[PDB]
Coordinates of C-alpha atoms and ligand atoms in Angstrom, one line a residue:
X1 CA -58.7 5.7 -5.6
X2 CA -55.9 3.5 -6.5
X3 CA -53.2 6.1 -4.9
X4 CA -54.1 8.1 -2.4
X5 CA -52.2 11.1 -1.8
X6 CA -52.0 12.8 1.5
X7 CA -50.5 16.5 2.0
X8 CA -50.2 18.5 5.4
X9 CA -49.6 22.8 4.0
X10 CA -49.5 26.2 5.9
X11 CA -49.7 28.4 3.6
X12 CA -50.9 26.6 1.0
X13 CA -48.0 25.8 -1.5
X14 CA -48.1 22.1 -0.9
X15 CA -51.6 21.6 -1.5
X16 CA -51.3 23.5 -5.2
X17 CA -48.0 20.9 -5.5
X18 CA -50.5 18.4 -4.8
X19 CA -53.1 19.4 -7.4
X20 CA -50.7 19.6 -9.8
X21 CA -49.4 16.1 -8.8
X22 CA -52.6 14.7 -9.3
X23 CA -53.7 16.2 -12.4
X24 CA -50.2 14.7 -14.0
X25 CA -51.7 11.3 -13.0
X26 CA -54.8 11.5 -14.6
X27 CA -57.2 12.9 -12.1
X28 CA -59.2 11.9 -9.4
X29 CA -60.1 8.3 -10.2
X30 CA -56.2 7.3 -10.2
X31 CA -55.4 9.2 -7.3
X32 CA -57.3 10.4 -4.4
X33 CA -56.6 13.6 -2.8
X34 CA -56.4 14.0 1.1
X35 CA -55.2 16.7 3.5
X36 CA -53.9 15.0 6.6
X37 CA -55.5 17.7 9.2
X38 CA -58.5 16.0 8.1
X39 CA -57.5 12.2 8.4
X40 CA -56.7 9.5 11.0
X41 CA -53.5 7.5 11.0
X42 CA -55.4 4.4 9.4
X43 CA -56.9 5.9 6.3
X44 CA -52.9 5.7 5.5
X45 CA -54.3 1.6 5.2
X46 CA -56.7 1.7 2.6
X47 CA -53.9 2.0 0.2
X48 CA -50.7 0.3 -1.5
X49 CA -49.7 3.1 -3.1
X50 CA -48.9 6.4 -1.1
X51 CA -48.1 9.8 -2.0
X52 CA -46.9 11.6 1.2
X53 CA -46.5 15.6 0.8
X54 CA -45.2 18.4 3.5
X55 CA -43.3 21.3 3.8
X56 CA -40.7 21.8 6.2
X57 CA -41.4 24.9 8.7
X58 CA -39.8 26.4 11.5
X59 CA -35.8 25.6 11.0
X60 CA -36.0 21.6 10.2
X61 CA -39.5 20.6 11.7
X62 CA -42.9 19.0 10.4
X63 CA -45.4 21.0 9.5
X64 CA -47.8 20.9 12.0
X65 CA -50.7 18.9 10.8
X66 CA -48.1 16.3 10.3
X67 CA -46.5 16.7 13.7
X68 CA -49.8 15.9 14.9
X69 CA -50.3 12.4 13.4
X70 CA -46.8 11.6 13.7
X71 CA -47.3 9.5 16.5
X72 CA -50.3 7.7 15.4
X73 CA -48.3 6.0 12.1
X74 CA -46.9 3.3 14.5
X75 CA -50.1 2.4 14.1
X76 CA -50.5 1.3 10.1
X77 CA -48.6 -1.2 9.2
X78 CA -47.1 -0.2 5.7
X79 CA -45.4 -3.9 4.7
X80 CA -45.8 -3.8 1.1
X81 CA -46.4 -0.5 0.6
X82 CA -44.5 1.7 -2.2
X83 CA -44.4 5.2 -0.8
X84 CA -43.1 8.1 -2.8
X85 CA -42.5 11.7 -1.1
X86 CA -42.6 15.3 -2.1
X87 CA -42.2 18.3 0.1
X88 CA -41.8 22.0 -0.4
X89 CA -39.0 24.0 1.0
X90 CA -37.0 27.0 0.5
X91 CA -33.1 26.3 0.1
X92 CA -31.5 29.8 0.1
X93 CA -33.4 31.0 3.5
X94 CA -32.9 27.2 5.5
X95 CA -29.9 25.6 3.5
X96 CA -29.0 23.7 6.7
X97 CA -32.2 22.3 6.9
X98 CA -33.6 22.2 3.1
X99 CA -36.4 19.4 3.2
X100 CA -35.8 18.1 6.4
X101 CA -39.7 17.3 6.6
X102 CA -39.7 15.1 3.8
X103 CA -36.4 13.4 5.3
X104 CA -38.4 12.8 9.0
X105 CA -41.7 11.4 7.2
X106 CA -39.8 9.0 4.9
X107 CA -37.2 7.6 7.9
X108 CA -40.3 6.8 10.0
X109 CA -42.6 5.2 7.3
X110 CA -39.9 3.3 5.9
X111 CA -39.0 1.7 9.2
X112 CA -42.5 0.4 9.5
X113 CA -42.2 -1.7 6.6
X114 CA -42.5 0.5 3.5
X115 CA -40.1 0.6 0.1
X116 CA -39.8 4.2 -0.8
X117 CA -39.7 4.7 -4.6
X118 CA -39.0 8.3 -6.5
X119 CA -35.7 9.0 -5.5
X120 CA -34.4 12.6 -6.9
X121 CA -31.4 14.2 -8.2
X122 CA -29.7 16.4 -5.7
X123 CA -27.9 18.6 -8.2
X124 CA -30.6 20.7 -9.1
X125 CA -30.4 22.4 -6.0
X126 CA -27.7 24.6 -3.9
X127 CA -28.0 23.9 0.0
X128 CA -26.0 22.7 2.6
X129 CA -27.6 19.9 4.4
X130 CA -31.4 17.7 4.1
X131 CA -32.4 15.1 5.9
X132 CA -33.9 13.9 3.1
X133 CA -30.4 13.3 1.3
X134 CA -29.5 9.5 1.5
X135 CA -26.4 8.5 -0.7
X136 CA -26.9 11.7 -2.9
X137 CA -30.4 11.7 -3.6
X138 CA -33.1 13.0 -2.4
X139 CA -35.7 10.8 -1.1
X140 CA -38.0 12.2 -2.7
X141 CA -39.3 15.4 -5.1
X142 CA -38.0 18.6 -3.9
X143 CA -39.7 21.7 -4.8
X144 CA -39.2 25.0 -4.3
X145 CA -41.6 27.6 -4.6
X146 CA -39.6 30.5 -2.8
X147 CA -36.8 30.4 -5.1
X148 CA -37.4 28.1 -8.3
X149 CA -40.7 28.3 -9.0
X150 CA -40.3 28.4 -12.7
X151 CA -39.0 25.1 -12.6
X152 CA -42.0 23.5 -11.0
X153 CA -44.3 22.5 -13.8
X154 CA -41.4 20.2 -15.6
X155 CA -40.0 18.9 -12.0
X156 CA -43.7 17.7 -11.4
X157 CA -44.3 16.5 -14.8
X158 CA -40.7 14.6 -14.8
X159 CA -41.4 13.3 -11.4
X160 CA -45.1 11.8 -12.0
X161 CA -43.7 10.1 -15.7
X162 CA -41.0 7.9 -13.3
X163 CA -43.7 7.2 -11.0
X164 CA -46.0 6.1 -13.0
X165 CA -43.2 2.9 -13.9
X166 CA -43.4 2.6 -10.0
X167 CA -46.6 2.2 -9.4
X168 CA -48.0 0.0 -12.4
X169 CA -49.4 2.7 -14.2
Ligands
FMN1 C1 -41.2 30.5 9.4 C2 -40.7 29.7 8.2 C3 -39.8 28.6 8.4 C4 -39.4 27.8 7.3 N1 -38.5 26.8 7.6 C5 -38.0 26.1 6.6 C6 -37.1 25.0 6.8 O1 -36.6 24.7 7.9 N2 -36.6 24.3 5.7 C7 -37.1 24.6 4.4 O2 -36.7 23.9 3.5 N3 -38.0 25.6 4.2 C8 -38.4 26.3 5.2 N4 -39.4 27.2 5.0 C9 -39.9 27.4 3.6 C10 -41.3 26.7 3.5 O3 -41.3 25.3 3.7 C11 -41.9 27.1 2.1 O4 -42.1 28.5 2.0 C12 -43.1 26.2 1.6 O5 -43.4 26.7 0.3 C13 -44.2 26.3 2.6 O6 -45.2 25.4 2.2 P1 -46.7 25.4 2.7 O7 -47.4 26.5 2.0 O8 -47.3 24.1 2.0 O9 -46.8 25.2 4.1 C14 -39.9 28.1 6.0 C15 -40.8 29.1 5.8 C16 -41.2 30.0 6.9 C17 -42.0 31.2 6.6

């Protein structure tokens, strides 16, 4: 309950991410598992610590359960929040837009306030542009089920460790 963790998926890679993510932390008393189709803009507010998750669909866009409450985050205010960001994506098919998702969602919630914290190394990856690249790091965990999905379990597991420093855990 002390995290909450909310994912928007299509076809349902982003919610296994999401499992994984929070079975690394411990389990469902550290974090709290919610799927944004389900959720209003201010259940984002019962938290200070936030785990944001989406894929990025249709050539650089939100998935669309995100789309939907995208308007409705003007709404929280997240001052004082640490936010971390994860996303699934496929970087050989949409190298011009790898993660771009991930890129909108942190852009908007850090502008209301926010300090984004899991930044990730970009040189794991081959693609051409992200919207989630600021000063050569990805704002957040990038992972990619279509092309490297061996390398999931130890991104995840890598990923949570660092976050865990983050978040006083
Ligand atoms: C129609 C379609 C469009 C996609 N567009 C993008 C894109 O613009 N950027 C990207 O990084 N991946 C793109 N992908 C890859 C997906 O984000 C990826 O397959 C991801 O695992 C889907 O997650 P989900 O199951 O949680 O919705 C696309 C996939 C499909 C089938």
């Amino acid at each position: 309950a002390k995290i909450g963790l909310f994912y928007g998926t299509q076809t349902g890679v982003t919610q296994t991410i999401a499992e994984s993510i929070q079975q690394e932390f411990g389990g469902e008393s550290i974090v709290d598992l919610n799927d944004i189709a389900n959720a209003d803009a201010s259940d984002l507010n019962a938290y200070d610590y936030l785990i944001i998750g989406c894929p990025t669909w249709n050539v650089g866009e939100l998935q669309s359960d995100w789309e939907g409450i995208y308007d409705d985050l003007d709404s929280v205010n997240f001052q004082g929040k640490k936010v971390a960001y994860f996303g699934a994506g496929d970087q050989v098919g949409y190298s011009d837009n790898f993660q771009d998702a991930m890129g909108i969602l942190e852009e908007k919630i850090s502008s209301l306030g926010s300090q984004t914290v899991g930044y990730w190394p970009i040189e794991g990856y081959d693609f051409n542009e992200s919207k989630a690249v600021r000063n050569n790091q990805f704002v957040g965990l990038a992972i990619d089920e279509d092309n490297q999905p061996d390398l999931t379990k130890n991104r995840i597991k890598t990923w949570v460790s660092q976050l865990k420093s983050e978040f006083g855990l």
